[PDB]
């Protein structure tokens, strides 16, 4: 498996 | 598996 | 599998 | 599968 | 399966 | 299966 | 399994 | 196993 | 096993 | 500008 | 742009 | 831009 | 910018 | 930028 | 910029 | 900058 | 800068 | 900077 998982709120 | 998750709240 | 999940609320 | 998800919301 | 799912509210 | 599901709302 | 998790909030 | 766990909150 | 957690608060 | 390119040879 | 290239030669 | 670029020789 | 090259050759 | 580059020859 | 590079030969 | 570089030779 | 530079041979 | 370098040759 080869992820990214990527989250950002401003 | 090959996955990008990517989430943005601005 | 190969995806992209992207979400972006402004 | 290859896929792309792509939602905007703004 | 090669899918776009493509949703945009503005 | 080669599909474009595409949705605006304006 | 290779993954990277990115989280931001400001 | 190869991760980055990364989180910054500002 | 290689990883790398990395979490800052400011 | 939304497009799939999808090529198949056998 | 949202586009997806894929292409498959067995 | 919201790109997949697939490539499979066999 | 968000981008998947996967690329495989057996 | 949002990006996986895999690439796996066997 | 997050980003995975990930190459295997066997 | 978050980035992982991954490479195997077997 | 949070980065892994991984490289097997064997 | 946060960095790991990984390097075995068996």
């Given at each position: 498996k080869v992820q990214?998982?990527?989250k950002?709120?401003?």
């Open positions: 990214i998982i990527n950002k709120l401003d």
